[PDB]
């Protein structure tokens, strides 16, 4: 299957000889400011090949029809990114921001606070480092791994802000499930964490519990998901990449962070449409 | 959505007042020895309410039609187990065995080898302990957490043996994806690992690489999945449960281990059918 | 597969011994006046066994969760009706009305105008006759077919009024497609017509063309669908039943008309939800 | 949605400016003699632009991966044909043949027997005529309709031979349903018949009943489908096209016959894969 998503179906098709890859995003609502720049830029982040929008858009706005795109087994990575880009366009309309970066490389793992990683620094970093104190070690560790004609794993951090509430189809299409599915699906990924993650297993209810009783939530141990639906809080997702199975990629977890973003994008933009008609009020409003 | 799976769709429906829950397994091939005992027994493992097969079976064998079952928001847990039971029946026909147990409770986390946990001991344990040296600490930790009117997290280990090769639909329905989706979807789950897991991120290619060149695979760092498809090796899956949000459940990760099994069951029995027609030879054989 | 629909999934499960059948409607928006009477009444139309709503509703309104129902291979017919009933509840909120009746029995086929069949008479008729001038012939034809220990076919007419515009997912989930799929799927059905039907094949563009240029549409040859999406006009659907393969059913096309309604109901209530997020404006409105 | 099918998903993407269209066939089993000629020829039948296979094939055989193809809102018709072509390749391996032709144009409707239409003549006809006695009238009727700057409807006949038994997922994915859905979905289609069709409604059980008791079936009133699953007999499908809404197309039902074939192809090749794992025996055989 080369298609992904319930309502916002993403499909990537290959092309032997690797001349170019391509994706199809179906399900995008009409009337969306199509920033073909933000698209082209995102594609430059991975392994950093121009994207050519074939349809679904006219006069700078989405038509509401399938948006075909071609960029010059295939290397799906390129497609996953294009598609995610497009989905971020619908996410911006709701001020939902998804960003990721490398916080661990080899035996070097930043021991900072989740909401303490420097995304500003990440954007300007050649490796998307989130801890400026270890940015030199990651590079060295990677370079060392390269020259040695070897590879090294990496730990990615994906944070999502401006989260709405109720995103996620409870029971068998929960936001964490979908996220886990899209992230584990990424090449080289061998583990996925949401919030406290593995550590939540070693805690007690009295320490993991996130209460509010008043305004918003106090603590965010949950990672931004409760019962499989988003609670409004930021999204704390961690994707761990194994070492790639100078040339080749001594640390694919770097390029992988860019893909982990695209995937989390597609999912969220997918739940966003799925949860549209979850309320009769919404529905009447939808039909005037 | 209360339905799950591509070809082997599992569906659970609730019943207010909690009188009883129910599930529907559609997609099961006809002619399968229906061990209604193995079903009833599995249901006794969780929180340890009789299962009443409504259809899909006749004269001890599956008819090939939807197998309705009723057991006395609902408590899906019971349903997920019934359904998984049924799927294990199809898995037995291929000698695929799925088993799980608790290896960590609170700050007590067994530091044994994956293929070293005692499943024999697990079966006889009231808490499915996989490390007999910590079985007393888990109990104590749980009891302590109970009396304190509090809860505690837990780390589950799911091992699958007799694995076939090629199970898993590459690209967007990979065996790890599906597994991650079904496991993260479980209540209280906040992390999922496959094989080396988070640790693979701190390794180097030269240490994670699983080679063979001759007979089977040497090392099993991959956890039994490569490229999203099973490679034959056992399945190393780890599900981390957070503390439940004497009465109540001071450690739902115990009951959760029973569910983590059912879910991994449904998935595997699902890929098993999906990968049926992946080869023209198979197909001709299928149609004589 | 016992599930039906894209967003509004209908699922019917059987029960050997025919003690009772059951259905599950998942996807229904929360906050919908649940008229359990209209449900119970519709069930009395077919072959004219009480319906017991198990969930999805609380205090007279839909919760937004799967609505389980049980009524006392199975006889799906009963389920299809229950499910359709529930879907009509969501359709009423938009004043979409779906009604059907028998207009042909055996060699007796009413030659009246589409928008001329008497639905008022149909409701009061024991056979849902739409042409009061042939109501005696249908009965006789049926009775004759009964006593003869034989069966007879029938032609059903389903009209849908208060149609919204844009219902239907263009390309491969068009409103006519879905309708054709749900109707042909009905037992005994061997033909399906939309509007002019077979006759449109013998016409010329200059006679089939439905223009407007001003207010609404002039003629309704299209049957209420253009390009696979509804245009606002009424829906003209015709389902032809073959003779059943005193006892037994000498003319199942009568009971079948009741089912043809339920099915057209499910579909429309399904496109209604699918077309919710087709517009960014709608979406923003949906999320306030 | 631009994707079609349960297991054999067909997807067509457009390209503004109409430079070219494209389709993706995912789900095709590996190891299938890819006759890129039969593909290119079929494309020449519609409106009678070279097809360029992008992937899914290597060394003349299908790899088992998505088969991308590009041919120079879009005009889906071209894509539907390419895709159907590919599916016929899998159908040939089971000697399932699907052929269609025009049997009615305007007020001229061949009154021959179903199994009496000349397909040999059809192949050589510029309009796929199935009744050589009316081939001059259809042409004239079409020409007349052209010069008049008008259009005319048409009646298509699709026959499928070498039918296997059991093709079709009972309940909500029956072979007739799928067929009705794929055919009604075609542009200009307003009616669909299976076997006796509308006429079966005017018959009596004693005349429609198809018995055997010995070898194969005696009569074929059913059209080759019973209970929603194929019974082995040929497939009798009729698709009625309305008049197109010298230039333009005065009778799109001609080109439409070529598409009605492709669609019936995709469906059958889809049920063929779906019904693979319907039997445990088949399954064991599939896995050796």
Curated annotation (Swiss-Prot), chains A, B, C, D:
Pfam families: Chorismate_synt
Keywords of the record: Amino-acid biosynthesis, Aromatic amino acid biosynthesis, FAD, Flavoprotein, FMN, Lyase, NADP
InterPro entries: Chorismate_synth (IPR000453), Chorismate_synth_AroC_sf (IPR035904), Chorismate_synthase_CS (IPR020541)
UniProt organism field: Campylobacter jejuni subsp. jejuni serotype O:2 (strain ATCC 700819 / NCTC 11168)
Chain's role: This reaction introduces a second double bond into the aromatic ring system.
Involved pathway(s): Metabolic intermediate biosynthesis; chorismate biosynthesis; chorismate from D-erythrose 4-phosphate and phosphoenolpyruvate: step 7/7
EC number: 4.2.3.5
Name used for this protein in its record: Chorismate synthase
Sequence positions that bind NADP(+): 46
One annotated Gene Ontology cellular component of this protein: cytosol
GO biological process: amino acid biosynthetic process; aromatic amino acid family biosynthetic process; chorismate biosynthetic process
Annotated family: Belongs to the chorismate synthase family.
PANTHER family referenced in this protein's UniProt entry, alphabetically: CHORISMATE SYNTHASE
Cofactor: FMNH2
Binding site for FMN: 187-188, 227, 242-245, 247
Note describing how the cofactor binds: Reduced FMN (FMNH(2)).
MF (Gene Ontology): chorismate synthase activity; FMN binding
Assembly behavior: Homotetramer.
Catalytic activity: 5-O-(1-carboxyvinyl)-3-phosphoshikimate = chorismate + phosphate
């Amino acid at each position: 299957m080369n298609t992904f998503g319930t309502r916002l179906k993403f499909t990537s098709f290959g092309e032997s000889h690797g001349v170019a890859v391509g994706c199809i995003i179906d399900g995008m609502p009409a009337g969306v400011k199509f920033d073909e720049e933000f698209l082209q830029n995102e594609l430059d982040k991975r392994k950093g090949d121009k994207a050519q929008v074939l349809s679904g858009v006219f006069e700078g706005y989405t038509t509401g029809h399938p948006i075909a795109i071609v960029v010059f087994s295939a290397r799906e990575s390129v497609a996953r990114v294009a598609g995610g880009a497009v989905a971020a366009m619908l996410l911006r309309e709701f001020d939902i921001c998804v960003q990721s970066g490398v916080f661990g490389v080899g035996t070097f793992v930043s021991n900072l606070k989740e909401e303490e990683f420097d995304f500003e620094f990440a954007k300007k970093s050649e490796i998307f480092c989130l801890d400026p104190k270890l940015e030199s070690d990651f590079k060295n560790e990677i370079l060392n791994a390269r020259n040695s004609k070897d590879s090294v794993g990496a730990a990615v951090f994906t944070k999502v802000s401006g989260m709405l509430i109720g995103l996620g189809e409870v029971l068998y299409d929960k936001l964490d499930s979908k996220l886990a599915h899209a992230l584990m699906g990424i090449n080289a990924v061998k583990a996925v964490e949401i919030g406290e993650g593995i550590n939540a297993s070693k805690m007690r209810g009295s320490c993991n519990n996130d209460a509010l009783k008043d305004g918003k939530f106090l603590s965010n141990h949950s990672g931004g998901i409760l019962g499989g639906i988003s609670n409004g809080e930021n999204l704390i997702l961690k994707t761990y990449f194994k070492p790639t199975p100078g040339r080749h990629d001594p640390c694919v977890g770097v390029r992988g962070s860019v893909v982990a973003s695209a995937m989390v994008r597609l999912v969220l933009a997918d739940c966003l449409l799925l949860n549209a008609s979850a309320n009769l009020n919404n529905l009447k409003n939808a039909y005037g």
